[PDB]
Design a protein around this ligand. Sequence first.
Ligand code: FES
Ligand SMILES: [K+]
Ligand SMILES: [Mg+2]
Ligand SMILES: [Mg+2]
Ligand SMILES: [Mg+2]
Ligand SMILES: [Mg+2]
Ligand SMILES: [Mg+2]
Ligand SMILES: [Mg+2]
Ligand SMILES: [Mg+2]
Ligand SMILES: [Mg+2]
Ligand SMILES: [Mg+2]
Ligand SMILES: [Mg+2]
Ligand SMILES: [Mg+2]
Lengths: 108, 232, 133, 164
Amino acid sequence: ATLNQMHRLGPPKRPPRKLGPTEGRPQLKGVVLCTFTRKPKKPNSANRKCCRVRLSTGREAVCFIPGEGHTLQEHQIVLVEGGRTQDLPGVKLTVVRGKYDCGHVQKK
Amino acid sequence: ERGWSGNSWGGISLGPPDPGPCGETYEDFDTRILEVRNVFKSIRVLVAVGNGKGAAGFSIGKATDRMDAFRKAKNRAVHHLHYIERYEDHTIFHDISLRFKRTHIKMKKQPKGYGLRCHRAIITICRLIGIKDMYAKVSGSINMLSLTQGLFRGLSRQETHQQLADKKGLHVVEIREECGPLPIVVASPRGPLRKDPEPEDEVPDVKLDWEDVKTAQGMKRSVWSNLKRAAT
Amino acid sequence: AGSRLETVGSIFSRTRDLVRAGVLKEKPLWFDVYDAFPPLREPVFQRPRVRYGKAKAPIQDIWYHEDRIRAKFYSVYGSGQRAFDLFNPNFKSTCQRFVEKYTELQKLGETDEEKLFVETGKALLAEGVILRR
Amino acid sequence: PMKGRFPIRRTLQYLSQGNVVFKDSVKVMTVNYNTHGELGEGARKFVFFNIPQIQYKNPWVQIMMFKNMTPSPFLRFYLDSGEQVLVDVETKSNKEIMEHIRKILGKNEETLREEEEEKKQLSHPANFGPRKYCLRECICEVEGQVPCPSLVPLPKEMRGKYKA
RNA sequence: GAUUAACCUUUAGCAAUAAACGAAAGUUUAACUAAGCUAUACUAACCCCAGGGUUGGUCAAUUUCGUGCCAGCCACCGCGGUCACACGAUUAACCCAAGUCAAUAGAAGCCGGCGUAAAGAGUGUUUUAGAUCAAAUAAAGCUAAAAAAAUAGACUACGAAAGUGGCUUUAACAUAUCUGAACACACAAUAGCUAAGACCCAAACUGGGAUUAGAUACCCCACUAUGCUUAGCAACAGUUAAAUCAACAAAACUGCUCGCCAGAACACUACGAGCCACAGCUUAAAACUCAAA
Ligand code: FES
Ligand SMILES: [K+]
Ligand SMILES: [Mg+2]
Ligand SMILES: [Mg+2]
Ligand SMILES: [Mg+2]
Ligand SMILES: [Mg+2]
Ligand SMILES: [Mg+2]
Ligand SMILES: [Mg+2]
Ligand SMILES: [Mg+2]
Ligand SMILES: [Mg+2]
Ligand SMILES: [Mg+2]
Ligand SMILES: [Mg+2]
Ligand SMILES: [Mg+2]
């Protein structure tokens, strides 16, 4: 572009950043509505442990439960952080282990 | 010792070139690997050689075995040597802006002690040549072969102070801020000296880079510029 | 051995640089001779370009004044029936005799091209040179 | 690279090279110049190279340009008193025009040096305050004085926790 | 208290400074001063006292077992199917260290481009400003071979483009700088409708005839809409000097101006607006998704 065009258009206007599933917050508290398993997209095969949770914002979202073995039940309180599960499409929230009802993974 | 990374061939030394069929020895030359690539199997290797005193070269070698490719590249490199002029045997004579294919290289002459703040491959090649103080910025496509070719081309096409003095028939006088207003004559014409002064261009019509002007005015804000780094 | 980059510098500059750099132990046998008696131009590779736009080659066309006279002669009396002998360094064609006689008239009289032509023809016929129109 | 011919004109260092600082009387400068003619060449250069510098050094002076309205280039300066100053600029280079206007309507170096000395008094070196305004934040930065407790703990006798 | 991922003591004194008041000694102050709590941070330690993460590549650093596309793991690329340096345990090593580093949010963004990747193919005129580059067409007639015009034309002319090639005549082919309209005015080509009219021939559709074994979709006959005639709805100016130059296209570049473009798809889309109006055209998003395209 010419100098006149750059002057008229002015400085570049970077679009506002997109808010993620946590809405720009480190973590979010949530209530477990139901627990289930989902299958990965297929270069990989597994039964990933997931749970549907109603967040403190009121939105219902699917979260992944990391680690080997969980004891989450309905009506239990969990803390969910960001971070996509690369295998599961549409799952962008992860339950924090060792906070509220979700306990740390049992040794071995 | 490792190269640019733990698992990377680049930057690794291959030792001196083998004594040539012409009968010359090259014990004062060091070889460095710049790139290794699988050709679909064979291996293509780009290596550079240099004695640290201005004589340096590079070559490609293709072979089924890696060591054969290394040997071929090294031996062919020693027979295609550039001589690179160095100002005071530590830096380049002037700033060099070049574009080889889609790779752009800006090189800046620097004072003593500045070090090599350059692309890692450029650091390797400069160490082979004997340049110790220089700044370099690589833009466009970062293609290793094009980078090497452009670097050698620009460094081989630099005009020395004596060349400029002979061309313009005038004294090349150096001004150093650390030396005050003292005029240092670095080169004088070998032939006769022109008695008419150079035109005092009130405003030269030079092509400026927005990068340099932006840095000079303080409008550069990059969090990655001027970071502390190991000695190079 | 020297550098095989024939497109970078010249054989002289490459040899000199590699000698000073210590790569070459001894100068080649021709180096001193080249240094003492260099060529007029340093033999550096250059790629020949094509001329576009209003760029014309600087070669001129070789014309002389007498060419005009020659043209008229070759248009009026035609090519002489006697043949040209280009091996003889001092060959004198009929047209050349006409040219010299015309020049003598011009330097010994006025400047009227048609009058000079006809008077030259008359004098050549007087000397005994056949000239058919 | 930087766009346009002579991109050095669009650098702050060049813009600060200007040596004409108008006296406070000058309010408006009009520059009438011609686009063609050798005798106006310098005036054209004056518009190309020096008007940016003059405007940079004199931000509150109104500079306006006019093209091909008269046979001859000229400058006119309007003063606060109501006076007008006419400067003919045929046959004059841009440097000559700059020197002429500097001489007739420019502040001299003595007045500028006086202004800088006045500016110096505003920043008294003895004051203590933020780095934006003062050399030192606190007296504890002065050697021989008691330093910060943040960097050197005070003895117990000088702390209230051990006095109460 | 409630709520949020977010969580300091229901301390002391007016001794200093500040404020209020007083003529003043002085009096008052949850301002403030001095303390309490908290790895949030900085500084300095430490007599014993170290943890957290990481170890396939990017990127410093794995031994032995267990499991077998399961359990699980990853920031990106990816690992896991009986020899897994990538999962779990264990050993060792690596980085930082009273911290470590999982999540979140900032810090750092266009002087680059527009034939083939996103981005410059209807034409002309005006336009506030910026720059320095100051054989056309229309209308009348007429016509030879057989309504549209052999030769000329192996010509390359006229016009802004679309286009213009029989002959005669009458009008007649803007502009002394350049750039600069979706929105103004003219043209242009594109097929289809509205009133009428003509109808030799042809012919979408609609009927009828003949045909294999889902006949011929295809052949034959007839006749509609229609074919016809009116009346209407990148530009400009320079250079060949340089190293020519990703590739292929069409040899490269400069100056100046306008328009347009910033990963894919959503999307020649939705909504809004304008224009029309059976079909619509112009401008033109967002959410979700992906590591590519
Ligand atoms: S800043 Fe003065 S005592 Fe700390
Ligand atoms: K007090
Ligand atoms: Mg490693
Ligand atoms: Mg807090
Ligand atoms: Mg507190
Ligand atoms: Mg109290
Ligand atoms: Mg406190
Ligand atoms: Mg493991
Ligand atoms: Mg495209
Ligand atoms: Mg225009
Ligand atoms: Mg345009
Ligand atoms: Mg639409
Ligand atoms: Mg809308």
